[PDB]
């Protein structure tokens, strides 16, 4: 129940930080 919800919220949080890091690079790349 609750331990599985806490692990998945750990996973999804560290997931969309990485896809946040991708858009940081591309918007920096498209300026050049």
């Amino acid at each position: 129940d609750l331990y599985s919800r806490y692990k998945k919220l750990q996973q999804e949080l560290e997931f969309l930080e990485v896809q946040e890091e991708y858009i940081k690079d591309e918007q920096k790349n498209l300026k050049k």
Binding site: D1, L2, Y3, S4, Y6, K7, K8, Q11
Partner: protein, 286 residues
């Protein structure tokens, strides 16, 4: 105004001065914020009669200031006078950081097994089995097993599965956990092989256990033992099914390794189906 009582130098006034400390520490917060050095004084005496209590009310006042480690380090010096009190919103917040400090400590300690680890308090597991005493009162052991996976300690993982008798399937549910959200593989086998210890202490073997464990643990002698057990109590129903599942799941050189452990009837039956020839031509037949 009772800091004036803390100025005087006899012990029987101190214990009535500190009894009035935690009585009104929730309402007179910042008055003690200047008398911090007086308490951390009164704390350093080894001849003082209630020095462990001084670590309690210091942990109360740093909890107001937000100095969370100062409440933590004085909860370490609090003795049993802290954890004997358990029904509060205060006590659960600074054992929350205590579990948080401890579970990031052991992940760091799992990186260096060769000595050089840290000295560790023991009331942090005195609240673990106390939480197990709550789980004894709860019947719900799914919550104490959660920290037991997180704390990287496996004898309490064995103690909570050799608990008061309520299902073997709860342990199977825990075993799923090892298929979905288990991240590391270094201690995964240790969790995955302490499950098959209690399975050999259990009366019925499963299918999904050896379908998960022993292909992630590659012990060919272990499945040759437990299927010889399934031969021994004359159970050719489920030994017949796990060979077809092993022939579908596992890889080369492990079927070759276990078939050496076969010869280390029903024996010639499991020669032919662990070679797995007959499953192919019926699959060719369809």
């Amino acid at each position: 105004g009772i800091i004036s009582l803390l100025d005087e130098d006899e012990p029987q006034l101190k214990e009535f001065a500190l009894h009035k400390l935690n009585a009104v520490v929730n309402d007179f917060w910042a008055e003690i914020s200047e008398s911090v050095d007086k308490i951390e004084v009164l704390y350093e005496d080894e001849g003082f009669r209630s020095r462990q209590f001084a670590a309690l009310v210091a942990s109360k006042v740093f909890y107001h200031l937000g100095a969370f480690e100062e409440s933590l380090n004085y909860a370490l010096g609090a003795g049993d006078l802290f954890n004997v009190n358990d029904n509060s919103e205060y006590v659960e917040t600074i054992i929350a950081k205590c579990i948080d400090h401890y579970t990031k400590q052991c992940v760091e300690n799992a990186d260096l097994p060769e000595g050089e680890k840290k000295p560790i308090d023991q009331r942090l597991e005195g609240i673990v089995n106390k939480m197990f005493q709550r789980c004894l009162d709860d019947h719900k052991y799914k919550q104490a097993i959660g920290i037991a996976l997180e704390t990287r300690r496996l004898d309490v993982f064995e103690k909570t599965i050799l608990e008061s008798n309520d299902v073997p399937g709860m342990l199977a549910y825990s075993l799923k956990l090892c298929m979905s959200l288990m991240q590391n593989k270094q201690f995964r086998n240790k969790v995955l092989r302490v499950l098959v210890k209690i399975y050999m202490n259990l009366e019925k073997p499963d299918f999904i256990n050896v379908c998960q464990c022993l292909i992630f643990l590659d012990d060919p002698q272990a499945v040759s033992d437990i299927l010889e057990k399934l031969v021994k109590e004359d159970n050719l129903l489920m030994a017949y099914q796990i060979c077809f599942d092993l022939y579908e799941s596992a890889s080369q050189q492990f079927l070759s390794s276990v078939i050496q452990n076969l010869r280390t009837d029903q024996t010639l039956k499991m020669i032919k189906i662990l070679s797995g020839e007959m499953a192919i031509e019926l699959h060719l037949q369809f």
